[PDB]
Each structure stands twice: as structure tokens, then as C-alpha cells.
Design an enzyme around this catalytic site. Structure first.
Site, mmCIF file in Angstrom:
data_model
loop_
_atom_site.group_PDB
_atom_site.id
_atom_site.type_symbol
_atom_site.label_atom_id
_atom_site.label_comp_id
_atom_site.label_asym_id
_atom_site.label_seq_id
_atom_site.Cartn_x
_atom_site.Cartn_y
_atom_site.Cartn_z
ATOM 1 N N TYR A 127 45.151 35.555 47.674
ATOM 2 C CA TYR A 127 44.599 36.781 47.102
ATOM 3 C C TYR A 127 45.097 37.943 47.945
ATOM 4 O O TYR A 127 45.061 37.887 49.173
ATOM 5 C CB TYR A 127 43.079 36.755 47.064
ATOM 6 C CG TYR A 127 42.501 36.041 45.862
ATOM 7 C CD1 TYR A 127 42.945 36.345 44.577
ATOM 8 C CD2 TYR A 127 41.500 35.081 45.994
ATOM 9 C CE1 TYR A 127 42.421 35.720 43.477
ATOM 10 C CE2 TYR A 127 40.965 34.442 44.878
ATOM 11 C CZ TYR A 127 41.436 34.783 43.611
ATOM 12 O OH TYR A 127 40.950 34.170 42.484
ATOM 13 N N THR A 153 47.726 34.404 43.180
ATOM 14 C CA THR A 153 46.874 34.608 42.004
ATOM 15 C C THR A 153 46.934 36.065 41.580
ATOM 16 O O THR A 153 46.641 36.965 42.372
ATOM 17 C CB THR A 153 45.445 34.172 42.267
ATOM 18 O OG1 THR A 153 45.472 32.789 42.645
ATOM 19 C CG2 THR A 153 44.596 34.323 41.005
ATOM 20 N N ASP A 155 45.719 37.402 38.435
ATOM 21 C CA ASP A 155 44.825 37.821 37.359
ATOM 22 C C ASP A 155 43.466 38.305 37.835
ATOM 23 O O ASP A 155 42.532 38.422 37.040
ATOM 24 C CB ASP A 155 44.668 36.711 36.276
ATOM 25 C CG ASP A 155 44.166 35.371 36.809
ATOM 26 O OD1 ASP A 155 43.809 35.280 38.001
ATOM 27 O OD2 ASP A 155 44.131 34.417 35.988
ATOM 28 N N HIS A 229 42.405 31.598 34.073
ATOM 29 C CA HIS A 229 41.502 31.466 35.232
ATOM 30 C C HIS A 229 40.234 30.728 34.817
ATOM 31 O O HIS A 229 39.115 31.088 35.225
ATOM 32 C CB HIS A 229 41.183 32.856 35.818
ATOM 33 C CG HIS A 229 40.818 32.863 37.286
ATOM 34 N ND1 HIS A 229 41.630 33.430 38.242
ATOM 35 C CD2 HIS A 229 39.712 32.429 37.942
ATOM 36 C CE1 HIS A 229 41.052 33.333 39.433
ATOM 37 N NE2 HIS A 229 39.884 32.738 39.276
ATOM 38 N N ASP A 260 46.955 25.566 33.299
ATOM 39 C CA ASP A 260 45.643 25.000 33.577
ATOM 40 C C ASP A 260 44.608 25.503 32.580
ATOM 41 O O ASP A 260 44.945 26.258 31.659
ATOM 42 C CB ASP A 260 45.215 25.242 35.043
ATOM 43 C CG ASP A 260 44.804 26.662 35.357
ATOM 44 O OD1 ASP A 260 44.622 27.502 34.452
ATOM 45 O OD2 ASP A 260 44.668 26.956 36.577
ATOM 46 N N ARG A 284 37.602 22.263 37.771
ATOM 47 C CA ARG A 284 36.206 21.808 37.760
ATOM 48 C C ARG A 284 36.010 20.281 37.917
ATOM 49 O O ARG A 284 35.139 19.892 38.700
ATOM 50 C CB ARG A 284 35.496 22.316 36.513
ATOM 51 C CG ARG A 284 35.293 23.833 36.547
ATOM 52 C CD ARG A 284 34.685 24.308 35.234
ATOM 53 N NE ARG A 284 34.495 25.754 35.113
ATOM 54 C CZ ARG A 284 35.352 26.581 34.510
ATOM 55 N NH1 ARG A 284 36.506 26.119 34.048
ATOM 56 N NH2 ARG A 284 35.051 27.873 34.392
HETATM 57 C C1 FMN Z 1 34.212 27.650 41.029
HETATM 58 C C2 FMN Z 1 35.643 28.098 40.834
HETATM 59 C C3 FMN Z 1 36.315 28.746 41.858
HETATM 60 C C4 FMN Z 1 37.630 29.154 41.680
HETATM 61 N N1 FMN Z 1 38.292 29.786 42.716
HETATM 62 C C5 FMN Z 1 39.606 30.175 42.545
HETATM 63 C C6 FMN Z 1 40.306 30.813 43.566
HETATM 64 O O1 FMN Z 1 39.776 31.046 44.677
HETATM 65 N N2 FMN Z 1 41.619 31.183 43.360
HETATM 66 C C7 FMN Z 1 42.234 30.957 42.138
HETATM 67 O O2 FMN Z 1 43.412 31.298 41.957
HETATM 68 N N3 FMN Z 1 41.541 30.337 41.137
HETATM 69 C C8 FMN Z 1 40.236 29.947 41.307
HETATM 70 N N4 FMN Z 1 39.585 29.311 40.285
HETATM 71 C C9 FMN Z 1 40.313 29.038 38.977
HETATM 72 C C10 FMN Z 1 40.998 27.662 39.048
HETATM 73 O O3 FMN Z 1 42.077 27.659 39.969
HETATM 74 C C11 FMN Z 1 41.550 27.263 37.674
HETATM 75 O O4 FMN Z 1 42.382 28.303 37.176
HETATM 76 C C12 FMN Z 1 40.518 26.887 36.648
HETATM 77 O O5 FMN Z 1 39.362 26.332 37.283
HETATM 78 C C13 FMN Z 1 41.224 25.783 35.855
HETATM 79 O O6 FMN Z 1 40.393 25.408 34.854
HETATM 80 P P1 FMN Z 1 39.566 24.036 34.897
HETATM 81 O O7 FMN Z 1 38.474 24.303 35.901
HETATM 82 O O8 FMN Z 1 39.087 24.049 33.492
HETATM 83 O O9 FMN Z 1 40.374 22.801 35.206
HETATM 84 C C14 FMN Z 1 38.278 28.894 40.461
HETATM 85 C C15 FMN Z 1 37.606 28.227 39.445
HETATM 86 C C16 FMN Z 1 36.278 27.826 39.628
HETATM 87 C C17 FMN Z 1 35.544 27.119 38.524
HETATM 88 C C1 9RW Z 2 38.394 33.001 41.865
HETATM 89 C C2 9RW Z 2 37.014 32.578 42.290
HETATM 90 C C3 9RW Z 2 36.183 32.397 41.033
HETATM 91 O O1 9RW Z 2 34.931 32.214 41.123
HETATM 92 O O2 9RW Z 2 36.765 32.411 39.898
HETATM 93 C C4 9RW Z 2 36.478 33.640 43.224
HETATM 94 C C5 9RW Z 2 35.181 33.580 43.717
HETATM 95 C C6 9RW Z 2 34.722 34.569 44.571
HETATM 96 C C7 9RW Z 2 35.563 35.614 44.934
HETATM 97 C C8 9RW Z 2 36.863 35.674 44.446
HETATM 98 C C9 9RW Z 2 37.323 34.676 43.603
HETATM 99 MG MG MG Z 3 42.741 22.468 33.946
#
Ligand code: FMN
Ligand code: 9RW
Ligand code: MG
Ligand code: FMN
Ligand code: FMN
Ligand code: FMN
Ligand code: 9RW
Ligand code: 9RW
Ligand code: 9RW
Ligand code: MG
Ligand code: MG
Ligand code: MG
Lengths: 334, 334, 334, 334
Positions: A127, A153, A155, A229, A260, A284
Site C-alpha cells: 500500500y 494494490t 484500487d 477487491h 481473484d 476468504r
Molecule cells: C479481511 C480482508 C482483508 C483484506 N486485506 C487486503 C489487503 O491488505 N491488501 C489487498 O491488496 N487486498 C486485501 N484484501 C482483498 C483480497 O486480497 C482479495 O482481493 C479478495 O479477498 C479476493 O476475494 P476472495 O476473498 O473472494 O477470495 C482483503 C480481503 C479481506 C476479506
Molecule cells: C484491504 C483491507 C480490507 O479490509 O479490504 C484493508 C483493511 C484495513 C485497512 C486497509 C485495507
Molecule cells: Mg478468489
């Protein structure tokens, strides 16, 4: 024993506090994009081929300079100590043992150096920070620690509005911290600053527009992740799986194209491959397995996904992931 | 008396042990392809013709050298003693009496010679074995016993993952055996070995890709069955009925093109015919009738289907199955 | 007072014996075509025009040589004494008073001469009989009694399989008879025999194929009714409303093109008109009104439909039914 | 605090008499067009852009000669004292404070001069009267009072049939009056009479046909609102959002093109903008907020919508509303 990824969600539901399960499960706004990630995969049907040689079926791929056991990596998910006391270390150990790349988060709850020390094939998710200097120092730390790719990342100029969390008044427990620390919107200039500062492949995560995919290749990206995302950013953003084929055609082999959002089985991996993906990320479900049974849980999940991918590929007549990318698909109803 | 095929499913539900009903009813994975077989037929609407001569409506066809009373055969279903003590003999007797071909399975629970002795129009379904020699000996047995076609199933390099069965811990009862015995993935070379070893028509069951249908004709097949194996093999495989029209156009009369998956009425037979099928296979409903009332049950089912096919054809202005193949269709919603 | 046609169905549900309500409501087979008649109308959206002169809005049309008050006629429905003791006489009186044509059935439960004596604009619906001579004598009776059109039903070589009735063991009460009497499949030769025997316009009811509509014009028909017989004949027959636009284009003004199946409001009449229909038939709702309140009930229904048609036309900027036929439509989802 | 517009509907449900909630919520006929307004927005997915400069994101637009804080105005809704004792004054004050135009109704329950005195950016909505002279005097009053645009509603030659109201026997409480007073169908001649009588931009509300949009530009309109009147006029009229793109292309910048019907979030505003709208109107949600908490309620609603619009724009890579109009969209299922 688990026989599907759905088994694990129920298990994680059992064990996690409600607010934490909601933080994990939720999307932004009305969760239209969250639901659409699943709808979009369910509408895709594969046209399998028959009577091909399957004497040496392999699910391995080469990506960003290394072999991976499956066309899959663990998606970046922040603050994994939310789900289990061993957090990122449990997941990274299971990923290593399974031959799957693990994406270390900027917002990891264990330091990136500790997670990288686990071994395996760590990637690092960036980030963009405050100022260019600290952003680049995070990249340098990751590279020094042996990470093999920078997943930038793109988005999240800011966080989406997660209504579950607002209604829950959800906040980070005091026992969970951003362990890499003692943020600003990224632009194409930020991408160039990163590219100029590292020899690692730069992978842009969160690309949905065809023109952005082209520009990513022009910008020197080694890959992109076609992604909304997990439905957590713009509510109403198209699912990545709906843009994937167009994007794969537009980049015409100029970079790796990952996808994804909603991958929940080996059959789903096969669908993504048939639409042209190099590989998928899974988010997830890995956290469900972590919550349910820690490192052993994630190991069981990756073993299950590995068998489902091998099974789907063979049933579809594909002895390699390359062959799976040449499968045709048909879009159905519901 | 039964007035629809749905009557019989409820009856079979009553009588069968739950695990056995699940073995019969189930599909692989999330059962997406199982459900899609039905969805796909329900979206097809026929455009009937009016005011044609119906003084000699006939549902008969010629296929693989013999007359059949309906454009239908009983699909191969393994281990029919699971559903009734008379198993394959009850079904084959009813099929004979109805003028419908019966497909004898490699995994029949009564020996192929005993079932063929029933008479009628037996076909034999082949699963490729261990080594070419025993596979060909199975084919030779079938031919020696008077089977009229070899239905080579080509969509099972291995069995799909049936989650109902795994969750049930379902296994063959000790009183059910593979009576033809005291397996390996098939390839196009296997097809050629069979074709070179028999004068019977070779029919490839489980074809979904247009290029595989073309190659089947090039390979000397006398027919194909466009099929996703009742949603029991690749979960996410397209329904055969969605590929049928394209496939019929591509083979341009070079072989018989049959279809299966979800046929539950004479109207469904009419839809398949209008999309270009030579004939259909019917699987689960025949087992429902067998479970519910043995030989008499299967007889009632085939009588019901015969009246429904005749009724649908006449209402659509078709005095022959050939005329039904010239009907147009329109794809609807839900 | 009733404010929609749905009000009347509930009322008829109250009063009628269950088996008789089922005889009225039901379709053939799985009732796919019955449901699809409604689905098809619900997917049609009108593009209304604004700011047009509405100082003399009229819902009148000319059809088959006479003025009608609405672009609608009462569909042929057999045995109306099933629903009310005054049967056909109650409906024909209300239709007369509303300025709506009434179709007298071959299977009417009051003689065609008695119903015609009511006055108004009676049409006569023909089912082809036994032999040409009696069929033509029925036509001659109708013409002698003052019927103004012969509605030759051509989609019943025999009756469809109505499973509600079979399951109910439904049969005609002894107090209901075919009052025109003390049947065989129709062909194009039958149509010619009728056309040669009468100067009345011959209208072919139950046409769905574009080629049959063309042939109807070539055959000298004065009109056709695009219809799947209310989903009571071939289960899986396309709804008439889905074929209407294509058919209207193909006949290019060579005959009147009516439609029926699922018309339940003035807005539905507007949709049919916008797709090109000359007029609609309405079946089940007229019987609901008859069952609920006899002649007065049917009067209220036709008054309600007249106000809804006028309202819809004006809101869509149409001062005449001709203008409504020039409206554009857009097909939506659900 | 409210986190979505859905929060406010539940609150308004609590407080309002049932009949008044139904007057507000209802549509005409079967409410097909009411539901379709929502369905249509839910099927639209945005393709967001990444990595653009968002250092000065602004949601402001210029329209009809003045700046507005958001690409949104409060839709004309008659008789707002039905929902709160301060009625139009509460809403107009909140709109003023938010920098949002407020549309004063011909059928306002507070006089147009009093509402205009609140200040802000008032528009005036015209229903055509009795005779040209009084219609034009209403326009002159509005202009004299400082209204900045005339919103001529052209889809009400008469009121649609609202079945909720009929069934409720709903009538105006004695304490609610048309405060501008002590009606006839509009035509294009009426539009010209208005245009000739004022220097204010004339905006035609309720346009759905592409040819009517073109004619509006030819007629000298400064804008149109693409609208089916919230599903309250012709039941079965296409949603404005389904015609918007075609209409925007046809007018090719000749007038402002607004849209309404079902806008319930900032994401919905973004979708409308991406389809080409200059701005949206919002109706029922403003009344929910008014009913729930008067002026403060409407203030909270507009603050929530402002944050949601800013959030959606930034997440989609748009620093201005003009950039949002250049976003692409993809139509999905459900
Ligand atoms: C709880 C949570 C935290 C996430 N944190 C990040 C993150 O810190 N950086 C990022 O690029 N994506 C983050 N993501 C997005 C995931 O990398 C991913 O794009 C998304 O979860 C994929 O979908 P799926 O969960 O349906 O497999 C997060 C997703 C979730 C559910
Ligand atoms: C990407 C991830 C999210 O929850 O999607 C996140 C949690 C807290 C702060 C920044 C990003
Ligand atoms: Mg996925
Ligand atoms: C219980 C069961 C056993 C089956 N066994 C075989 C088999 O041994 N060989 C084969 O080619 N297909 C087998 N099939 C697939 C059927 O031949 C057929 O493709 C499918 O059942 C047709 O779909 P339907 O059941 O919807 O009519 C089996 C299907 C079921 C349900
Ligand atoms: C109970 C019943 C009896 C019918 N009898 C006849 C008939 O004798 N002749 C005929 O041409 N159509 C008959 N029909 C079909 C109607 O004329 C018409 O095509 C169909 O009802 C129109 O659909 P609707 O009922 O949805 O308005 C009958 C329909 C019903 C429901
Ligand atoms: C209770 C109510 C009263 C309305 N009154 C008027 C009116 O007087 N003039 C007008 O042009 N539109 C009127 N409308 C229509 C709105 O301006 C607008 O087109 C519609 O409400 C927008 O849809 P939305 O409510 O889904 O946001 C009214 C709508 C409602 C619900
Ligand atoms: C094809 C049939 C099936 O269940 O689909 C089968 C069962 C047991 C072993 C092989 C095949
Ligand atoms: C057409 C009508 C019907 O029920 O659809 C009918 C009833 C009895 C006999 C013939 C026709
Ligand atoms: C437009 C508005 C409505 O309810 O849609 C209205 C209410 C009463 C009278 C005229 C218009
Ligand atoms: Mg079948
Ligand atoms: Mg009708
Ligand atoms: Mg709106």
C-alpha cells in the site's frame, strides 16, 4: 476431514466472534459486487475435452521466475492474527509446505521479515504510503527479506465503506497491530517509482478496465490481478472474472494476468484458467481454514484445492495448466 | 397409475434407503451441472406446426441397423441391483417389451450374457480397462452375446467427486457385485483399437466439444452421445443440450447424435429432437420406476413416455421423428 | 368494486368447486407454457410518447367488418355453465353491452342459436368434426344465426394432457352438455373447405410458426390468433406474445393478427398492440368474473378493462389503437 | 446516524400512518415499473479506473447557470406536509444548506413564494392548467420569486391508477392543501407557449422515447429528465435508466439530460453519471428523511449522499463528474 470449501466456512462461523466473521465476510455498500463475484463464476460453464493423454497430469506453473505447485497464490489479507493466534505465520507455513506463494501484507500483524523467514515463495503486497521514501523503504525491506514479487494494490485510494463494520462499531483489538510499522492514493507515477527501485516483478492488483491493463504492460508491470477487491472497495464494480477474457486478449501475453474474487473450488480455478488467467488468488477461504484449525487447517484447505484442481483438469482433458487455458467456455443462466 | 415422471421419483424416494437414493440422485461438486441439465431444457420452447396430416403418426426410428419404438434408449446405469432385487433383468425385460434399446453396463450387477439373453435390442457400454487385451475381450463378449452397439464412455478418466456419497460414507453393499468380473483413461488410440476389433457401431458417450464430435466422425464412430454424464463428472461442464445444435451442425449427418441429461417427459424428447438429436438416453427416471415397482414399474414408465412422445409430436404437427427434427425452437427465460 | 383482474380471480377461487377452478386454471404437462405466457408479457416494457393530442382518445377498432369498442374479444371457452348457471348467455349479454365481440364455442353449453339471439357481435369457434359435411353444417348454422366470423381452432388435433384434471378425476357434470349436438384433426384441406363454404372471414386460432402465418394468408384467412391455447395444448410451446412481432412483420398487413394468452390488464393489451396485434382475446379472467358475479360480474370486468386500456393508451401518448401499434418496446429482465 | 438510505426508509415506516406511507411508496397498476427502476440500476456495473490523480476530487457541477454541490436535485414531490408539519420548508432549507437544487411543486402544500424565500437554488415544477393564461401566470410567479428553471412535467395527461390508494380509500387530509391555488393534458404547443414566455431554461420531465428527446432539443428545451415518474404513471413504462444511454447519444450535447427513478445511493448516482446523465433527481428517500427527522433528517440524508458520491467517484478514479461520465459500464445479471 473437509470435502468442500463450504465445510470450512461453517467451521469458521462457529469459532469466530460475530464482528470478526463480519469483518472477514463483508463487502462495501449493498454488497452487490461481493455477490456478483459468485454469480459471475456460477454462470461460466466449461466445455471439456475428451480422450487426451493424462499420463502425466501436472498442476504446476512457472510464474515470476519460480515454480508453483498450483495456479494459485494466497491473496493478501490484512491482520491475520484476528483469526488465529499464529496469524500470518500459520498461513505462510502451510503455503510453503503446499508449494503455493504467500502474499505478505503491508498491514500484516506479524512483521514481514518474520513471515519471510518461514521460507517458501513469499510475495509482498504494497500500500502506498505518506511519502515516496517510506514506500520505497517498505519495498526495499521486502526485497532484502527475499520476497519475489511486489503486489502493488492500486484500487484503494482510500478504504471502501463496509457497512457491517460501521454497524458493529468494529475496531482492531488492542492485541492486533500493524507489525511493519512503529497512506496516500497511488498514481502511475507511484508505479514508476516502484519499478525504478526494484528488480522484482511489479504486479498491479485491482485492475478492471481494459485500458488500465494495457497501460500496466506499457508501465513495465510483470503482472496484474484483475480484481474488485472481493467486493470491498467500489460497490457496483464489475467482477474481475467478467473482465478477464477481454483483458487477456488486450495484453496479448505482455504480462501475467491473475484474477481473484469468489474462487471457492478447483472447478472455479479451472473456469478462471479457461477464461485466460495465469493463476488465481484465494482470500476468504484461507482465513476460514486458519480460523477453524490454524496451520493444519490451511494445510487441509490447500490439499483439498490441489485435489480439486487436478480432478477438474483431468475431467476436462487437460494435462497441463496451459492446456486448460485453451479450453472454451459457454456463459449460461443462473 | 402415474401421470408424469415426477410421480415416480416420489415413489422411489419412499422405498429406497436414503444413501442409495443419494447415490442415484446426486451430482459431482456443487451439483451445478446437474441442475443446469434441467435448467437448459426448461429454457427451450418449441414452435409447433399446425394443420399437417397426422393420420399415421409414428414415433419409430431406425438406429444402428434396427428399428426402435421411440427415439429413446435406456442409459447405462451401473449396479441396478442397488435399486431392486431383479436389477438389470427387470429393466431389460421392460425395455425389450417396449421396443426400446437397453444399454448393458460394464459395471452391471448381473452378467452381460444373462442380460443379453433377455433378448430385445441390447447395447453394451464399455469402460476402458487396465490393458487393451481385456478391454477388447469385454467388447468381444458383448458382440458374441448379441449386443448391437458398443457405447464407449469417454468422459470418465476417473470418477467425479460425488459429495453426497463421501458425506454418506456410501459403499457397495456386499450383495452387489460387478458381475462381469472375477480401469484406465481412454484415448483416441483406445477408440481406434475398439473400432478395429468390432463390426458393431462404436458410439462415443460423453462428447461436449464441437471439435471432439468432428474427430469422433473422423475416427469412424457410428454415433456420439452429447452428455455431461448427468452432472456426475466435471462439475461446471456445459449441459449436452446446450451443445447439441452446434454439434449436429458440425457433424452434418456423419454419425448419429444422441443426447442425455435431464430428459423427464415426452415434451423433453421433443425438445431434444427439435434441436437435432437422433434419440435421447434416459437414466435416473428408469431407476425410479425400477425402485418403485420393478419390471412392471419400468413398463409403466416406458408406456407413459411413449404416450407423451406421441402426444407432443402430434400437437407439434409431426407425423414422424424426422419431421420433429425440422421443428424450430426459441430460447426463453426461466 | 374491483380495481384489477386479480381481484376477480380470488373471488372465483372462493366460489367454485376446487376441481372446476382447476379445470379453468390449469395447463398441460408441467404448465411451462402456462407460466411462460405471463412471464413473456412481464418482460415487455413500453416506450411511451409524450405531449401528443389526446382530446379525442378512442379505444375503438374496426375488425372483420364491424366496429368494436376495445381491441379485444372474449376468447372461446367451452362449457361456461360450469362456472355459473346462466353460462354463455350471461357472458354474451355483458359482451354485447360492452361492445366487445363474443366467441361462441363449438362446445358451448347453451346452443349457438340461443347465444346468437342475444345480439351483439357474435363470432363462432369451430372444432373440425368427424366428417366434412357436419363440420360445414356447423359453419352454416353459425352463419345463418348471424355470426360474423368463423374462428377455426387449429391447434387441437386432440386435447393436451391436463394433469390437474387427471389427478382430480375431473369429468363433466351431468347437468352440463355440449348443447350444439344431439372430432378429427384439421388440415389445410379443412381450412379450404371452410373458406369455400362461407363468405364470413375465416380466422385461424393457434398459429405460432411464422411459415404457418404466411400460409394462412395464402390460404385466404381473414385473420389469425397467435396463441398456444393458454398453455393447455403442447407443454413447451412458445408463447404467442413471443412470436407476435415476427409474425406481424411476415404477414405485412395481409390479415388481422390477434394474440392471446395471459392478458390480465389494459397495460397488457397495450403491450400486445405495441408488438403489432390487431386485437387480443381474453379467456380465464372472463370466466373468473362470470363465476364471481354472473352477467354483472362480466360487465364489471369489461368496464375495468375498458378504463385500463383507455388509461394506458393515453399515458403512452396514443389517441388511437393505430398509434399504439406504432409504439416501440424494450425487452427487460423479470 | 444513518449509514445507508435504507436506514431511513425503515424509520419513515415507523412514524408515518400506513396509508401515507403507501401513498409515498406505491406505483401504478402491478408496480412493474416501480420494481423495474430498481432492477435496472442493480444490473448496471461500473468499470472503475485506477491510479488517477485524486488530489482535488470535486462532486460539483454547473447546471442551468449555477453551481450545484452534487450532480443531484430534490425531485418534485407534491404535498410534503403529508410527511412532516414543516413540509416543503424543511426540505428546501436542508437542500439550500447542502448546495442542492430544490424543485418546488405546482401542488406544493406551502406556497411557492414562501419556499423560494428560503433561498438556495429553487426550481419550479409545472403542471399544465385549465387554460394557457393561468399556466403562464404560474410560470411568471415562479420566475418573479427567483426560481431558476421551469421543470415542465409532461408524462401526466392525467394521474396513473395507484391501486394502493384506491384500496386504502386514500384522500388528502383536510389540513393539507394545494397552497399555490385559491388541469389539462400538455402538448408540444404548451411547451412552446412556456418557452416563449420565460427566459428561464425549460426542462421536460418524463421523457422516455429517443424521438421525444430529440424533439425536446428542437423545441428549445434546456434539459430533459428521463423518467417514468417513479413507476407511478404508465405501469409497464421502461425505466429511464434503460433509455438514458441511447438518449444521451441522440441529443449529442444539445441539452442537459437528467434521470430519475430508484436512485438510492452514491453508487447509483455514479451509475447514472457513467451512463451519461448530467445529474439525477431523488424523490422518495428525501421524503423518508423528512418523515423521520424533519429538516435535520433531510440534512443527514444529503450529507450521507454527498459522502457516498465522493467515495464512489474516487474509488472509480474520477476527480470530476465529467470524468465519471466517461466511465464505461457492463450490464450484468440480477
Ligand atoms: C479481511 C480482508 C482483508 C483484506 N486485506 C487486503 C489487503 O491488505 N491488501 C489487498 O491488496 N487486498 C486485501 N484484501 C482483498 C483480497 O486480497 C482479495 O482481493 C479478495 O479477498 C479476493 O476475494 P476472495 O476473498 O473472494 O477470495 C482483503 C480481503 C479481506 C476479506
Ligand atoms: C484491504 C483491507 C480490507 O479490509 O479490504 C484493508 C483493511 C484495513 C485497512 C486497509 C485495507
Ligand atoms: Mg478468489
Ligand atoms: C447412478 C448412476 C449410474 C451411472 N452409471 C453409468 C455407467 O456405468 N456408465 C455410463 O456411461 N454412464 C453412467 N451413468 C450416466 C448415465 O448413463 C447418463 O449419462 C445420465 O444418468 C443421464 O442423465 P439422466 O439420469 O438425467 O437421465 C450413470 C448415472 C447414474 C445416475
Ligand atoms: C377452460 C378453458 C376452455 C377453453 N375452451 C376452448 C375452446 O373450446 N376452443 C378454443 O379455441 N379455445 C379454448 N380455450 C383457449 C382460449 O380460447 C384461449 O386461447 C386461452 O384461454 C387464452 O388464454 P387466457 O385464458 O390466458 O386469457 C379454452 C381455455 C380454457 C381455460
Ligand atoms: C409521493 C410522490 C409525489 C410526486 N409528485 C410529483 C409531482 O408533483 N410532480 C412531478 O413531476 N413528479 C412527482 N413525483 C415523481 C418524482 O418527481 C420522481 O419522478 C420520482 O419520485 C423519482 O423516483 P424516486 O422516488 O424513486 O427517487 C412524485 C413522486 C412521489 C413518490
Ligand atoms: C458412471 C457411474 C456413475 O456413478 O456415474 C460409475 C459408478 C461407479 C464406478 C464407475 C462409474
Ligand atoms: C379447448 C378446451 C380446453 O379445455 O382447452 C376443450 C375442452 C374439452 C374438449 C375440447 C376442448
Ligand atoms: C405527481 C404526483 C404523484 O402522486 O405522482 C401527483 C399527485 C396528485 C396529483 C397530481 C400529481
Ligand atoms: Mg436424460
Ligand atoms: Mg389472453
Ligand atoms: Mg431517483
Amino acid at each position: 476431514t473437509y470435502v468442500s470449501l463450504a465445510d470450512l466456512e461453517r467451521a469458521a462461523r462457529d469459532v469466530l466472534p460475530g464482528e470478526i466473521f463480519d469483518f472477514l465476510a463483508g463487502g462495501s455498500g449493498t454488497e452487490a459486487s461481493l455477490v456478483a463475484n459468485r454469480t459471475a463464476l456460477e454462470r461460466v460453464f466449461v466445455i471439456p475435452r475428451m480422450l487426451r493423454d493424462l499420463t502425466d497430469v501436472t498442476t504446476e506453473i512457472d510464474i515470476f521466475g519460480r515454480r508453483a505447485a498450483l495456479p494459485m497464490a494466497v491473496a493478501p489479507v490484512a491482520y491475520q492474527r484476528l483469526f488465529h493466534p499464529e496469524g500470518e505465520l500459520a498461513v505462510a507455513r502451510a503455503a510453503r509446505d503446499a508449494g503455493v506463494p504467500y502474499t505478505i501484507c503491508t498491514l500484516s500483524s506479524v512483521s514481514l521479515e518474520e513471515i519471510a523467514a518461514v521460507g517458501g515463495r513469499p510475495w509482498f503486497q504494497l500500500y502506498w504510503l505518506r511519502d515516496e521514501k517510506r514506500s520505497l523503504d517498505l519495498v526495499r525491506r521486502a526485497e532484502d527479506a527475499g520476497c519475489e514479487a511486489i503486489v502493488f494494490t492500486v484500487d484503494v485510494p482510500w478504504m471502501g465503506r463496509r457497512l457491517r463494520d460501521m454497524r458493529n462499531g468494529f475496531a482492531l483489538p488492542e492485541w492486533v497491530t500493524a507489525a511493519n510499522f512503529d497512506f496516500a492514493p497511488a498514481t502511475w507515477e507511484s508505479v514508476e517509482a516502484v519499478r525504478a527501485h526494484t528488480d522484482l516483478p511489479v504486479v498491479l492488483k485491482g485492475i478492471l478496465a481494459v485500458e488500465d491493463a494495457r497501460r500496466a504492460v506499457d508501465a513495465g508491470a510483470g503482472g496484474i490481478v484483475v480484481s474488485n477487491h472481493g467486493g470491498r472497495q467500489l460497490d457496483g464494480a464489475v467482477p474481475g472474472i467478467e473482465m478477464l477474457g477481454e483483458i487477456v486478449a488486450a495484453v496479448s501475453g505482455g504480462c501475467e494476468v491473475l484474477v481473484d474474487g469468489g474462487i471457492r473450488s478447483g472447478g472455479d480455478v479451472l473456469k478462471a484458467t479457461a477464461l485466460g488467467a495465469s493463476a488465481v488468488l484465494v482470500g476468504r477461504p484461507v482465513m476460514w481454514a486458519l480460523a477453524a484449525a490454524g496451520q493444519d487447517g490451511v494445510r487441509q484447505l490447500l490439499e483439498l484445492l490441489a485435489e480439486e484442481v487436478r480432478d477438474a483438469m483431468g475431467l476436462a482433458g487437460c494435462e497441463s495448466v496451459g492446456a486448460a487455458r485453451r479450453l472454451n467456455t459457454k456463459l449460461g443462466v443462473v
